[PDB]
Amino acid sequence: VTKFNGLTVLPPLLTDEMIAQY
Amino acid sequence: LVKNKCVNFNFNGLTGTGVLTESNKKFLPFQQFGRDIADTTDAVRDPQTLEILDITPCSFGGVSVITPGTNTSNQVAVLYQDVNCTEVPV
Amino acid sequence: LIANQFNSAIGKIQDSLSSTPSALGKLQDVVNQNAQALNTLVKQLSSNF
């Protein structure tokens, strides 16, 4: 699986490390 | 020219706004200013001295107030989303 | 025999996922769809209306 004009992306609360740990 | 400081800039009519930094990409001798996939400028060749400057937008992001219940306490916290603390006080 | 079948089947998962570029087509489709949505949103700024 593969700058800002007022558009913001928010990080997932469960980061990729915690998702992987879950 | 000012680097690493958010400054309004105007290069040959670009009339952009954002912080200009030193860039690594090399333009062709005729290629004036860069661009992105979404057709938004993200580089410019300094017209006086020929060097490539990577422009990035002024830091913005939502500010959220992490507070407990007002009945429990009145002391609050503030999150400045997606920005480093160096430019927070501004 | 069941253990060998299960392990070799897992190796088959690994090989099929690596070789086939369309194994992750669903999540990649979701990511590409979000990217197209955002790119169209940005391009709409360039539009006169």
Ligand SMILES: *[C@@H]1O[C@H](CO)[C@@H](O[C@@H]2O[C@H](CO)[C@@H](O)[C@H](O)[C@H]2NC(C)=O)[C@H](O)[C@H]1NC(C)=O
């Ligand atoms: C006029 O423009 C020229 C070319 O852009 C500048 O020439 C520079 O001169 C300095 C010394 O003054 C040299 O170190 C540079 O190598 C030259 N070239 C470049 C591309 O910067 C010149 O400085 C400009 N004059 C003024 C007064 O700004």
Ligand SMILES: *[C@@H]1O[C@H](CO)[C@@H](O)[C@H](O)[C@H]1NC(C)=O
């Ligand atoms: C806050 O806590 C107090 C003390 O338990 C309670 O009386 C009050 O109703 C609470 N307020 C809310 C909005 O729940």
Ligand SMILES: *[C@@H]1O[C@H](CO)[C@@H](O)[C@H](O)[C@H]1NC(C)=O
């Ligand atoms: C703040 O964080 C960014 C992103 O991690 C980092 O590159 C930068 O050096 C920091 N800012 C300053 C002014 O040091």
